[PDB]
Structure 1
Amino acid sequence: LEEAPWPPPEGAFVGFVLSRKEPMWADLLALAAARGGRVHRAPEPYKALRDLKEARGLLAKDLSVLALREGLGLPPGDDPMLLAYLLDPSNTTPEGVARRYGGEWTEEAGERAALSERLFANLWGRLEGEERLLWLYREVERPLSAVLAHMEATGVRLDVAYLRALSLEVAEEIARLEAEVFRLAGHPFNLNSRDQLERVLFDELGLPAIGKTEKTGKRSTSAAVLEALREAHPIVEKILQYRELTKLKSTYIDPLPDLIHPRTGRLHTRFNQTATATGRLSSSDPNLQNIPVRTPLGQRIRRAFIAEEGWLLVALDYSQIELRVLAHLSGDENLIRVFQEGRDIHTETASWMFGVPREAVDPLMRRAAKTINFGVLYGMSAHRLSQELAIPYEEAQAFIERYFQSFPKVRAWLEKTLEEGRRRGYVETLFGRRRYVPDLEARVKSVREAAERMAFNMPVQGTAADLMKLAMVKLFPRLEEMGARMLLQVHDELVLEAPKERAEAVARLAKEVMEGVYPLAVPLEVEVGIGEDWLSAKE
């Protein structure tokens, strides 16, 4: 490991240290590069950043993000993490990827660059004759790492003053519920403490314990348990309400405003690219993929997300991408005609299980077909089906068998995936992204059947992901050539920011690029809204 003075040969492997994991908040403590068997250690890291053509190494996207806040372009290129992730998506961290493919992840820039070259070598050849996963790395993941670096650096604009006024409203509503419940308890206790609540609910008050917690076996105070004791006591509704408010206060309203960045006046997530078993992205520090939208107070928080002045937000949402993906994968003639005909899946699905004349008089069957249609994706069981309808474990089974008479190639796809899973030891997406699921042949049924749900969701969830990522790759350069921005992805939706004048012209472009990303035996449909805020934009 011979030490050459800094200016490194072109195309070298970078190795960097940050004071903290978040590139947008980090100081560049150290910089290195490696090519052949030579270590080029930068004396002045931020200065040294100017000399690179592209970032190439573990966490390439991170360095490209920090470079971007500093004004420097610098895209990300090869990343052994991206390759390892495609071999086996349980490869999430460089600690692990190193300590599996022949290195040690250290807290030193040069050894991080020495690790990069070494890890990349040992992995790119480990991808010999994986045409499919090489296509995924070239035409999806490497390019996307750039797109994500641009998104992460842009950030999304937030109305702080608005959030701070909320905090004061919600604070006060919390205070009333708090003092209600205590009066009902006949004493005050910490309502954030589920231990203390447990005692209050089940010992002190006389209430029935419905279920128990997994690891420790305490009486559960979850929503599903409290929603089931709604009738039994007026303290329960209050507790439910107090959880709603404190969850949203503690998770979103209170902390988000403090994470505005001095240089931008914007919020910056991290989009982790090698963090999940299916090939979805996750979002982090903070997570903007779980900003609320169901509840009223929830919907008020979402208004806080706004466009720069003079711009608008464009929100684009795929419409049942996962069902459509299933239809494509299963090849169920019946099911794909429901999307080709431009019909309302759950309407038609109800009108096929029961087989009601045409489409007529189905208010409680709409719920019934909707529920099954996502419950085939997660492996929803009869009991669970029986619990969500008010109907018993018996009629619910027949719903399941009926649905498979409606859709016989779904079942055959299901079973085929399971068997090839056991055979090859993994399952895979339409683009050949794989997830190894070795418990498919476990001797304990609970764990086997748990494995099976994991196993047959992955091809659909990962294909929806694959489809979204490829769209992001395709769409982005069209947005840049239009001075539009790409702000967030939320699994099957995209939030873009565009200038008021061109906003409709961006919407149209974005929508069409997404409906046409990779055409299937069904069509992809996309809803689009425009607005000053995320809520308004009509997600």
Structure 2
Amino acid sequence: ALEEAPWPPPEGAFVGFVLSRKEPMWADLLALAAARGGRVHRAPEPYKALRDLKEARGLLAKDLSVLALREGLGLPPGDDPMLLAYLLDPSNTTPEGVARRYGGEWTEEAGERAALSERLFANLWGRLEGEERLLWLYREVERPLSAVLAHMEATGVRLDVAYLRALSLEVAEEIARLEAEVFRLAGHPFNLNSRDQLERVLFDELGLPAIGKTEKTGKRSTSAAVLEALREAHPIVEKILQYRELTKLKSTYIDPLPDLIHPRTGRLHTRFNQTATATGRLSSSDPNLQNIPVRTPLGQRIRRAFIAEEGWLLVALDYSQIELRVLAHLSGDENLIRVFQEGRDIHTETASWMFGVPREAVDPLMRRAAKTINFGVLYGMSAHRLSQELAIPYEEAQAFIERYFQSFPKVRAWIEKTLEEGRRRGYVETLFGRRRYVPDLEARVKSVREAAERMAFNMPVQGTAADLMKLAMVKLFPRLEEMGARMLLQVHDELVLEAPKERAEAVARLAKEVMEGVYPLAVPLEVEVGIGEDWLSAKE
């Protein structure tokens, strides 16, 4: 019922747009529109009309901003109803769901999307009236962050395409040797990529013991954890596990990545989704650059393909024991706090016990393997699983889960306190007040209930760490532009920067200080920083 008015609209209008595809760096701006003051303005030519806007206000404001930056236009994203709804409830991840829940319908017409954005913002803003903690997260964190993420996506990252092309040819030959040996041992060829066909060969034909079942379908599992106990006694299992590793890296990273280079920027562009997680974390998609291999030596080779522009250097900064430090602040445990005040390393100490090796002989590989243990046990890891991963008896596993807790009596108390709030209020909170609704805390089925519990007390820890990182990105970004530096990637507790070689050292120091003193806790926040030509070298 809005009054149709000719383009352009006045400043402050809510924008509506339609893309040919979800990726703003690859999308064709099909239509553009705006709504304000009971009026709607439809653009005759979307691309030309994009120059008329001063800022992007409305649903998916960041995506339009990325496309604008792609066209060399300085169009910063502003108010976004998606961010408002996401703070009220992280379950609000899609424009279709948000519009349905908060008044309206997500259609495929720009004018209607513009009117929807204006209408959704008014209602959602009313929902936040009174929520001062959520409003603070919106004004001081989420909204300015959308501008930062827009620049990150539009900038992209340089990739050594020729290196990955040559690597693909080499790996393919290595894969052929493994699959050929598997088929020989099986006595017949089959689809090794098919876990169903593999299940028959291993358990029915070869008569191997089945120790685990799948979650949904309840089939005999062929996962790495299951095959691990079988790998040393049987050669074929060893071959499969090696086959799994090669094909995983080749089909997910080595092959698709080089084909995603933008023809105009010459770099690889990912998407940093701001409303996709239930804890407040960001996510990376199309392609996912938050899961680039780093553990295995072969996986490290892939990470070397991520390089800096000529004359530039990569700067990688990582928070040290971030969730363990957050836990000390939230729980207020005197003992755990003093641990960080003395400058101890839990990850190193745990690895010392796992491998029976002095603290001065613990390599990075050993230390990273202890992360799964420390974080695992912390968030309710069964004593059975730990004994299976460490190749140690179940009795030694029980003692470790135990010994992990008595040192800090407050941690147990914080968990139980957190769970009660979730059962009563219906949600749990981070340090800054970010919520997550966990209804299954009172489920009558124990497996479902206990699973919901583990989701419940993990959120304040993972979420707070996410809030700290987001706030750090907001403060650091303008400091990089003034130095001619770039913010490329975010990996939960890691920031990948690109700086000129004559300013790389200065950027590294500044970014480190910003991240460490973004929001002081009861324990000091430490950050490890490295500089290199590639991502792997940038992290020592």
> Smaller-chain TM-score range?
over 0.9
Identity across aligned pairs (percent)? 100
When structure 1 is superposed on structure 2, of 384-393 and 288-297 the one drifting more is 384-393
Determine whether 1:60 maps to 2:61.
Answer: yes
Deviations 1:351-397 (CA, angstroms, capped at 9, x unpaired): 99999999999999999986653124422122223333344445533
TM-score by length of 2: 0.95
How far off its partner does 1:231 sit? 2.6
Unaligned runs of 5+ in 2: none
In structure 2, relative to structure 1, the CA distance for the partners of 1:532 and 1:346 (3 Å cut) is closer
In structure 2, relative to structure 1, the CA distance for the partners of 1:27 and 1:526 (3 Å cut) is same
Deviations 1:317-362 (CA, angstroms, capped at 9, x unpaired): 1111000000111111100111111122246679999999999999
**1: CA distance between counterparts of 2:366 and 2:306?**
37
Deviations 1:278-322 (CA, angstroms, capped at 9, x unpaired): 000000000000010011111011010000000000000111100
Determine whether 1:142 maps to 2:143.
Answer: yes
- Report the 3-state secondary structure (helix = DSSP H, G, I; strand = E; otherwise coil) of the residue aligned with 2:539: coil
**2: CA distance between counterparts of 1:363 and 1:60?**
41
**2: CA distance between counterparts of 1:361 and 1:250?**
33
When structure 1 is superposed on structure 2, of 70-79 and 353-362 the one drifting more is 353-362
Q: Is the 8 A contact 1:55 1:63 kept in 2?
A: yes
**1: CA distance between counterparts of 2:230 and 2:483?**
54
Deviations 1:241-293 (CA, angstroms, capped at 9, x unpaired): 11100110000000000000000110000000000000000000000000100
In structure 2, relative to structure 1, the CA distance for the partners of 1:88 and 1:334 (3 Å cut) is same
- Report the 3-state secondary structure (helix = DSSP H, G, I; strand = E; otherwise coil) of the residue aligned with 2:314: strand
When structure 1 is superposed on structure 2, of 398-407 and 450-459 the one drifting more is 398-407
Deviations 1:102-140 (CA, angstroms, capped at 9, x unpaired): 100001001101110111001011001111010000000
How far off its partner does 1:222 sit? 0.8
- Report the 3-state secondary structure (helix = DSSP H, G, I; strand = E; otherwise coil) of the residue aligned with 2:499: strand
Structure 2 residue aligned with 1:401: 402
How far off its partner does 1:399 sit? 3.0
Q: Is the 8 A contact 1:484 1:497 kept in 2?
A: yes
How far off its partner does 1:402 sit? 3.0
**1: CA distance between counterparts of 2:303 and 2:207?**
39
Q: Is the 8 A contact 2:354 2:390 kept in 1?
A: no
Deviations 1:463-502 (CA, angstroms, capped at 9, x unpaired): 0100000000000000001000000000010100000111
- Report the 3-state secondary structure (helix = DSSP H, G, I; strand = E; otherwise coil) of the residue aligned with 2:405: helix
In structure 2, relative to structure 1, the CA distance for the partners of 1:505 and 1:240 (3 Å cut) is same
**1: CA distance between counterparts of 2:352 and 2:200?**
48
In structure 2, relative to structure 1, the CA distance for the partners of 1:109 and 1:93 (3 Å cut) is same
In structure 2, relative to structure 1, the CA distance for the partners of 1:450 and 1:15 (3 Å cut) is same
Q: Is the 8 A contact 2:351 2:362 kept in 1?
A: no
Q: Is the 8 A contact 1:479 1:486 kept in 2?
A: yes
In structure 2, relative to structure 1, the CA distance for the partners of 1:367 and 1:402 (3 Å cut) is farther
Q: Is the 8 A contact 1:213 1:219 kept in 2?
A: yes
Q: Is the 8 A contact 1:353 1:399 kept in 2?
A: no
Q: How many residues align?
A: 539
How far off its partner does 1:99 sit? 0.7
When structure 1 is superposed on structure 2, of 406-415 and 212-221 the one drifting more is 212-221
In structure 2, relative to structure 1, the CA distance for the partners of 1:248 and 1:346 (3 Å cut) is closer
In structure 2, relative to structure 1, the CA distance for the partners of 1:186 and 1:160 (3 Å cut) is same
Structure 2 residue aligned with 1:527: 528
Q: Is the 8 A contact 2:35 2:115 kept in 1?
A: yes
When structure 1 is superposed on structure 2, of 90-99 and 30-39 the one drifting more is 30-39
- Report the 3-state secondary structure (helix = DSSP H, G, I; strand = E; otherwise coil) of the residue aligned with 2:479: helix
Q: Is the 8 A contact 1:368 1:389 kept in 2?
A: no
Unaligned runs of 5+ in 1: none
**1: CA distance between counterparts of 2:228 and 2:316?**
33
In structure 2, relative to structure 1, the CA distance for the partners of 1:360 and 1:483 (3 Å cut) is closer
Q: Is the 8 A contact 1:6 1:40 kept in 2?
A: yes
Cα-Cα RMSD: 2.7
**1: CA distance between counterparts of 2:295 and 2:379?**
21
In structure 2, relative to structure 1, the CA distance for the partners of 1:395 and 1:231 (3 Å cut) is closer
**1: CA distance between counterparts of 2:147 and 2:309?**
23
Q: Is the 8 A contact 1:377 1:457 kept in 2?
A: no
Structure 2 residue aligned with 1:461: 462
- Report the 3-state secondary structure (helix = DSSP H, G, I; strand = E; otherwise coil) of the residue aligned with 1:355: coil
- Report the 3-state secondary structure (helix = DSSP H, G, I; strand = E; otherwise coil) of the residue aligned with 1:25: coil
Q: Is the 8 A contact 2:89 2:435 kept in 1?
A: yes
How far off its partner does 1:218 sit? 1.7
**1: CA distance between counterparts of 2:232 and 2:348?**
32
Q: Is the 8 A contact 1:323 1:373 kept in 2?
A: no
Q: Is the 8 A contact 2:59 2:82 kept in 1?
A: yes
Q: Is the 8 A contact 1:347 1:359 kept in 2?
A: no
How far off its partner does 1:197 sit? 1.2
In structure 2, relative to structure 1, the CA distance for the partners of 1:459 and 1:30 (3 Å cut) is same
| 1:254-403 matched pairs, under 5 angstroms | 254-346=255-347, 373-403=374-404
Structure 1 residue aligned with 2:17: 16
**2: CA distance between counterparts of 1:528 and 1:6?**
49
Deviations 1:411-454 (CA, angstroms, capped at 9, x unpaired): 01111101111111100100000001011111111111001000
Q: Is the 8 A contact 1:271 1:281 kept in 2?
A: yes
Deviations 1:204-254 (CA, angstroms, capped at 9, x unpaired): 212111212122222111111111111331011111111100110000000
In structure 2, relative to structure 1, the CA distance for the partners of 1:412 and 1:179 (3 Å cut) is same
Q: Is the 8 A contact 1:427 1:458 kept in 2?
A: yes
Q: Is the 8 A contact 2:348 2:362 kept in 1?
A: no
Deviations 1:16-58 (CA, angstroms, capped at 9, x unpaired): 0000000000010000001122111000100010000100000
Q: Is the 8 A contact 1:474 1:513 kept in 2?
A: yes
**2: CA distance between counterparts of 1:493 and 1:310?**
23
In structure 2, relative to structure 1, the CA distance for the partners of 1:354 and 1:271 (3 Å cut) is closer
In structure 2, relative to structure 1, the CA distance for the partners of 1:498 and 1:123 (3 Å cut) is same
When structure 1 is superposed on structure 2, of 368-377 and 232-241 the one drifting more is 368-377
Structure 2 residue aligned with 1:31: 32
In structure 2, relative to structure 1, the CA distance for the partners of 1:93 and 1:366 (3 Å cut) is closer
When structure 1 is superposed on structure 2, of 220-229 and 382-391 the one drifting more is 382-391
Q: Is the 8 A contact 1:353 1:403 kept in 2?
A: no
